[PDB]
Design a protein around this ligand. Structure first.
Ligand SMILES: CC(C)[C@H]1C(O)=C(C2=NS(=O)(=O)c3ccccc32)C(=O)N1Cc1ccccc1
Length: 557
């Protein structure tokens, strides 16, 4: 069937939208070529609508149903609880979309009478009605990129009251079941340091390793009613409370398999018969369905010793090579199986033979050397987009600061350290907002971080290595230098002078600020410190961090 049907009505913005890079006094110090940077807006939503709209066909063979059986047995060992209205309420981001029924996220966060009353009524309605499609809002995502100029991505989400209800019914399921179903292949359990460790160990565990990523053409749109009904029969495998089973059935019939689409004005835009991007189960479903299709497609293409690594739609496979030309041939069969399963590719998969040449979760493995000369494997990426987004957030305050999320996840990298750390810690010194908590997104969940806890966080997710890394790979050094050339970013020399200034200004503050300069910027000095393990790092409660993915799922910690 068609993934979408369209009435003709436009996808409208909520507030004001800027497509070109905003400029302040601090912009040029980071980036010179400003017309290379742009953000997607609801202006381009019509191109995306075309790209997401297509007929899906599905052919389900025995390999599909074999893998599904296996998944179901594992899923049936799961016991999940109903979350109380209040517990579910506290998982709402403070900046999450307001209800059409006269309340907002903070009303939900403080547990106001109006909101909780309404949520209980939506829950009741979920139990007593398993048929009526639930209204969703269709919105274009505003996201910053550097030119090659992409269209806006879409977001489809239900009302805040329904979102809290999904939480009551399914928060426990989406958090625990995926790791139980897919084990080592569930990506969202790993921190950066564990992701590199798992990748490298897998690679070397093969006699002759072959790795590939699979770019699916718009995953969400390819998800069918079959896939959504199938993933529900997976959730139902869990030992659930009778109310949960009804709510999961109900949310599946009425909301997950599809429903009517409404712009931010309140106008009917059409109908969805594919994955909604902004529901609680978006990350988990995508991870389940992708694992399913891909698992079976490996069997169809007779790939041997497959270790898959799934994070939603994003998939990477490491296997035993059959030889370059047979690896190529096997991937053509894998693609054929995936296409048959309604997961056709965008750019076709290619077989790779250097771990560093494989991009998974927008990242590649790479090698650097710590203080003692030890080979340290770390994850990195082309820094273009993070730096473009950092240029936008230099001039426009955003609910989720993507630079901080980057500094957290890419802390051991050359570009995060010498540019991202230096620039924003300078920004925060100038504003005196170092003790001010900032929000970022890790695995889809929104986290509230205080900048001064960064060395403690970095030690915990990467090890003390992340502060000592030098002698980066020439390929990595080039790629960074190539990106900085393109963007018009100052050279390494400039950033060293700024970091020396940042560090010295942090040292004067004493305490957590001094600890910041010491650890984050020891790279910028000639007479470097030997960095000790920070004692106040075992203190940190990093629970919720690497448990599951929640992209579009409207989750807060
Ligand atoms: C952007 C940063 C914060 C982080 C992330 O949240 C994601 C990430 N967030 S997400 O839940 O939207 C998602 C879905 C699928 C695949 C990845 C992701 C990611 O890829 N990251 C990059 C990354 C770096 C090192 C190790 C693993 C991932």
């Amino acid at each position: 069937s068609m993934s979408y049907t369209w009435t003709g009505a436009l996808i409208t913005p909520c507030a004001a939208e800027e497509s070109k890079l905003p400029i302040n006094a601090l912009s040029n110090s980071l980036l010179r070529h400003h017309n290379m940077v742009y953000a997607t807006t609801s202006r381009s939503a019509g191109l995306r609508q075309k790209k997401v709209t297509f007929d899906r066909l599905q052919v389900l063979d025995d390999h599909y149903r074999d893998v599904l059986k296996e998944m179901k047995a594992k899923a049936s060992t799961v016991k999940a609880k109903l979350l109380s209205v209040e517990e579910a309420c506290k998982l709402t981001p403070p900046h999450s979309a307001k209800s059409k029924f006269g309340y907002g996220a903070k009303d939900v966060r403080n547990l106001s009478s109006k909101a909780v009353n309404h949520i209980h009524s939506v829950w009741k309605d979920l139990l007593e009605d398993t048929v009526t499609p639930i209204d969703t809002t269709i919105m274009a995502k505003n996201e910053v990129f550097c030119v090659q100029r992409k269209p806006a991505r879409l977001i489809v989400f239900p009302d805040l009251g329904v979102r809290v209800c999904e939480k009551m019914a399914l928060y426990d399921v989406v958090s625990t079941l995926p790791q139980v179903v897919m084990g080592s292949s569930y990506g969202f359990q790993y921190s950066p340091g564990q992701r590199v460790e798992f990748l490298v160990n897998t690679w070397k565990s093969k006699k002759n390793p072959m790795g590939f990523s699979y770019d699916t053409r718009c995953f969400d749109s390819t998800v069918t009613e079959n896939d959504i009904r199938v993933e529900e029969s997976i959730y139902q495998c869990c030992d659930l409370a009778p109310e949960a089973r009804q709510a999961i059935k109900s949310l599946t019939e009425r909301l997950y398999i599809g429903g009517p689409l409404t712009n931010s004005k309140g106008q009917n835009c059409g109908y969805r018969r594919c994955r909604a991007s902004g529901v609680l189960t978006t990350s988990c479903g995508n991870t389940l369905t992708c694992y399913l299709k891909a698992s079976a497609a490996c069997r169809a293409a007779k790939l041997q010793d497959c270790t898959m690594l799934v994070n939603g739609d994003d998939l990477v496979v490491i296997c035993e090579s059959a030889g370059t030309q047979e690896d190529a041939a096997s991937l053509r069969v894998f693609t054929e199986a995936m296409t048959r399963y309604s997961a056709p590719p965008g750019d076709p998969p290619q077989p790779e033979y250097d771990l560093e040449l494989i991009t998974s979760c927008s990242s590649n493995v790479s090698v650097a050397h710590d203080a003692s000369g030890k080979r340290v494997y770390y994850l990195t990426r082309d820094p273009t987009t993070p730096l473009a987004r950092a240029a936008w957030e230099t001039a426009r305050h955003t609910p989720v600061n993507s630079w901080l999320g980057n500094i957290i996840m890419y802390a051991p990298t050359l570009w995060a350290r010498m540019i991202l750390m230096t620039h924003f810690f300078s920004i925060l010194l100038a504003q005196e907002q170092l003790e001010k908590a900032l929000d970022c997104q890790i695995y889809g969940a929104c986290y509230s971080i205080e900048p001064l806890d960064l060395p403690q966080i970095i030690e915990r997710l990467h090890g003390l290595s992340a502060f000592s890394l030098h002698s980066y790979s020439p390929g990595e050094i080039n790629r960074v230098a190539s990106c900085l050339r393109k963007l018009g970013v100052p050279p390494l020399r400039v950033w060293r002078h700024r970091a020396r200034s940042v560090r010295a200004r942090l040292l004067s503050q004493g305490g957590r600020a001094a600890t910041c300069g010491k650890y984050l910027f020891n790279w910028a000095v000639k007479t470097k410190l030997k960095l000790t393990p920070i004692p106040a790092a075992s203190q940190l409660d990093l629970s919720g961090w690497f448990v599951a993915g929640y992209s579009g799922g409207d989750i807060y910690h």
